[model samples]
Target: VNSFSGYLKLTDNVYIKNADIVEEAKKVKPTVVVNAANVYLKHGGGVAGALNKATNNAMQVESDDYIATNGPLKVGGSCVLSGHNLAKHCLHVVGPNVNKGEDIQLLKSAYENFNQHEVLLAPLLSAGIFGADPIHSLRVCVDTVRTNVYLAVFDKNLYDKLVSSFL
Candidate 1:
């Protein structure tokens, strides 16, 4: 099941999918896409990495400029990646690392805020090499977010972990 890409309705407009986050994003043509990056706007691996590369490294350049003027992000802070390549924009959130004992409120804020977008896409934030617990983040997202309608995309292993926990 983890090898396939499938979609589910989280709500009337919200969606959840297990697929290549980048490709799924292209399919949706979302207005806002979440990127898991560090405070320095490194825009490294996982969904962020893939999205950055997909945009021909333009995202990294934009992120660098944003971080330069705004300063580095903290565990819970995020900024926009303007003039994006694929999607209309990017929501670069600095996620928590459970291994470092950081709180996950920041990640939740990415969804809790956003001024109510119509088409937004997000991946499993902080679930990759960044070292946050995927299941915990999933639970937090489910509990704290209620009004918005965004597409939550999951890659292979994260989707597997989620399904194994509860399908």
Candidate 2:
């Protein structure tokens, strides 16, 4: 995994790492970590599932209760929950699924709703199971978020694409 120390401009606060989000979140201890969650907030698989495991399933339990009380979080909607063993809090946002003909605005809104913290750990939102274009996902992430962001990318191809975008 590489840090953007030499490659990116000092002014750029967005950093990329080819690692697991859970590990990076633990290392950085960001104020909040972004979970590319479904509207139902079920951390069943992918990054969400890994995070759920890291927090000893407290995330899933809280998410279930949150949904039961507040109903499903619509696309672009977000909720902050206890991060437990991860970060201080977990920001769960429902990204738009391109396969469902969802609008890009919703995807942007998901990133925009991060509630700016000192440091934020996130993945390439919507680029995985949601079927959003990787480059577009990365673009939306960098454009919408103003806080210091540490993006954890596990896939080599995705990491290369992100790195090339910055270059």
Candidate 3:
């Protein structure tokens, strides 16, 4: 159940898929892809790491420069950077870290900020080290995003769960 060949269509314009976010971005060619990022914009691992790798670390370089210029991001805050080899641009959101006792408000606000894009792609915010529940994170994305989205899930189990939940 965790492995699937294709995506689940949640709606005419929304889809959930188990795949590399960067690879999917290439196919979907969304206006902008969203990264579950940290305040510092370091692409050490998780979705951030994947995008950075695909761009030969050019995305990271841009992110690092962004931090240097604008300062570290705050929870619920975001910035746009070049997507390099993955896509044209990427919107980075610093989701709240429940490990630090942050709540859903910030994560919701982060998702809300993404609404302006026409075709957007995103992942479960704060579902990694930030410790937000994936189900709730997905709900936030579903509830908040007004634009068309491609929900990319990296974990096989989460992907299956999302497919089941939507179908």
- TM-scores of the models, in the order given: 0.79, 0.87, 0.88
lDDT of each: 0.66, 0.79, 0.80
Task: Kindly provide the TM-score of model 1 when superposed on the true structure, using C-alpha atoms.
Answer: 0.79
> Model 1 lDDT vs. the true structure?
0.66
What is the overall TM-score of model 3 with all chains considered together? 0.88
Candidate 3 achieves a global lDDT of 0.80
At residue 36, candidate 2 shows an lDDT of: 82
Mark the regions of model 3 whose C-alpha exceeds 4 Å error after superposition. 1-6
How large is the C-alpha RMSD of every model relative to the true structure? 4.3, 3.2, 4.1
Candidate 2 residue spans exceeding 4 A from truth: 1-11
Q: For residues 52-134, could you state the per-residue lDDT of candidate 1 as single tens digits?
A: 88888988888778777888887776777663655777877777766667776666865564445544567666777767777
lDDT of 3 at 65: 84
lDDT of 2 by residue, 71-101 (tens): 9998988888888888889888888878778
Error of 1 at 88 (Å): 0.3
The ten-residue window of minimal lDDT in model 1 covers 1-10
